[PDB]
């Protein structure tokens, strides 16, 4: 039977942000920090922002999309707590990043998004927190449309770090699943959902990332068939699937069935080209035999 482990490793390589874009992302994220720091020093020095890279970039699971888009999440914290609405802190950050050359900001519900014409964006979730060095205190996320929400971005990173330890295939599995979401889109869940599901339900097959992904898909399906949910570690009741009606759930679980069916056929294929086409159908066009 065809062995596609090498093709999976090369696919993982193709999913990485390119050298040029990663340097531009980091340079831009440093420029944004200085721009925000200068804005508050000039206009509201009573509040001092501090920063913490979070999300996939901090966890080491970032992929570029099929359009070569990529991003970085940089949390913007105000300590101690400003006694203003969350939308007020967001508006100031939005005003601060406005005017960045080659970029246009967008005020999302839970972050300020800075879209760069060069093909990347930086998301700036805004937080307030009372104490500078207290990991037992969870920060409050600013929300445009409502009240602050308790959040635990650092706890997610710690949790995933413990799952990654002695387990380097996990970041590859998360990357494969994120590329699956990036290929189908529409009803598909976000990358954080793939991080949680792969970490909880991972199955291992040393030397065969193709078999490992197949086994992990079936493990995820078994868990979600019993209880269709995806709770964020450290934040109970933060269920990433809580808004999914029966239609969206059925669409996702049907796509998971089809992925599993084709993965089974690929693993049992003698023809390496056919096997690669079955995987590529769901993982996207950066997967190939050549
Ligand atoms: N429902 C949520 N609860 C808590 N944190 C969230 C939630 N959604 C997003 N985040 C935070 O934003 C980060 C990025 O979310 P997401 O867009 O799914 O990841 P990616 O950076 O891979 O696109 C997550 O790592 C998490 O810290
Ligand atoms: N609970 C959260 N904690 C931290 N960041 C978040 C959270 N939820 C969303 N984000 C960030 O905000 C981005 C988009 O926010 P979203 O909720 O999609 O706003 P909108 O509904 O306007 O699209 C996400 O990609 C993520 O990076
Ligand atoms: Mg994001």
Say whether 104 sits in a helix, a strand or coil: strand
Please tell me whether the peptide bond between 80 and the residue prior to it is cis, using omega within 30 degrees of 0: yes
Q: How far apart are CA 129 and CA 89, in angstroms?
A: 13
Cα separation, 135 vs 27, in Å, equals 28
Q: How many CA atoms lie within 13 A of 100 on its CB side?
A: 29
Interhelix angle 5-15/169-184, rounded to 10 degrees, is 70
What DSSP character marks residue 17? P
How far does residue 212's CA lie from ligand 3's centre (Å)?
Answer: 27
Tell me which residues have their CB closer than 6 angstroms to ligand 2.
Answer: 73, 108-111, 123, 125, 141, 151, 153
Q: In the PDB record, what is the listed experimental method? A: X-ray
Distance 114 CA to ligand 3 centre (A): 11
Catalytic positions, written as ranges: 71, 73, 123
What residue spans define the domains of the chain? Answer: 5-14+158-283, 17-151
Q: Which CATH superfamily is domain 17-151 in?
A: Beta Polymerase, domain 2 (3.30.460.10)
- 229-237's contacts with Cβ under 8 Å and 24+ in sequence apart are 230/189, 230/193, 230/196, 230/197, 231/196, 232/152, 232/156, 232/192, 232/196, 233/152, 233/155, 233/156, 233/159, 233/160, 233/196, 234/152, 234/155, 234/156, 234/159, 235/150, 235/151, 235/152, 235/155
Residue ranges with strand state E in 117-250: 120-124, 126-128, 140-141, 149-150
Q: Which tokens go with 143?
A: 């929300």
> Cα of 122 to ligand 3 centre, how many Å?
8
- The residue written with tokens 């949790």 in the block is 159
200 class by beta-carbon count within 10 Å (0-12 exposed, 13-18 middle, 19+ buried): middle
Q: Which ligand is nearest to the CA of 120?
A: 3
What separation in angstroms does the CA of 112 have from each of 87, 115, 227? 10, 10, 33
β-strand 70-78 against 126-128: which pairing, if any? parallel
178, 63 in Cβ contact below 8 A?
Answer: yes
Q: What is the resolution of this structure in A?
A: 1.8
State which ligand 2 atom lies nearest to the alpha carbon of 144: 22
Q: Map residue 72 onto helix, strand or coil.
A: strand
Count how many Cα atoms sit within 13 Å of the Cα of residue 110 in the half-sphere of its side chain: 7
Burial (Cβ within 10 Å: 0-12, 13-18, ≥19) of residue 60: middle
Strand partners, 77: 50, 127
Two tokens, residue 263: 């993965």
Report the C-alpha gap between 237 and 241 in whole angstroms: 11
Which ligand is closest in space to the CA of residue 108? 2
What is the second-level CATH architecture of the domain 5-14+158-283?
Orthogonal Bundle (1.10)
């Amino acid at each position: 039977m065809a062995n596609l482990d090498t093709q999976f490793q090369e696919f993982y390589g193709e999913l990485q942000i390119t050298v040029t874009k990663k340097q531009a992302l980091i340079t831009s994220h440093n420029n944004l920090r200085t721009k925000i720091q200068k804005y508050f020093a000039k206009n509201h020095p009573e509040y001092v922002p501090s920063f913490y890279i979070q999300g996939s970039y901090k966890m080491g699971t970032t992929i570029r999309t099929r359009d070569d888009e990529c991003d970085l999440d940089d949390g913007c914290y105000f300590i101690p707590k400003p006694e203003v609405k969350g939308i007020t802190l967001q508006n100031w950050v939005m005003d601060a990043v406005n005017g960045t050359v080659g970029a246009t900001p967008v005020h999302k519900n839970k972050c300020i998004r800075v879209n760069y014409a060069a093909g990347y964006h930086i998301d700036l979730p805004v937080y307030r927190k009372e104490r500078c060095n207290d990991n037992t205190e969870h920060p409050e996320l600013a929300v445009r449309d409502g009240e602050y929400e308790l959040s635990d971005p650092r706890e997610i990173v710690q949790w995933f770090n413990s799952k990654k330890k002695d387990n380097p295939v996990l970041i590859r599995l998360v990357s494969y699943l994120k590329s699956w979401c990036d290929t189908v889109r529409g009803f598909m869940p976000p990358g954080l959902a793939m991080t949680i599901l792969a970490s909880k339900y991972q199955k291992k097959h040393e030397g065969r990332d193709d078999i490992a992904l197949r086994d992990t898909l079936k493990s995820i399906r078994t868990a979600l068939q019993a209880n269709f949910s995806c709770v964020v570690p450290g934040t109970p009741y933060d269920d990433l699937f809580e808004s999914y009606d029966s239609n969206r759930q059925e669409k996702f679980m049907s796509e998971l069935n089809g992925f599993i069916e084709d993965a089974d056929r690929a693993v049992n294929e003698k023809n390496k080209l056919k096997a690669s086409k079955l995987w590529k159908k769901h993982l996207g066009n950066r997967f190939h035999l050549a």
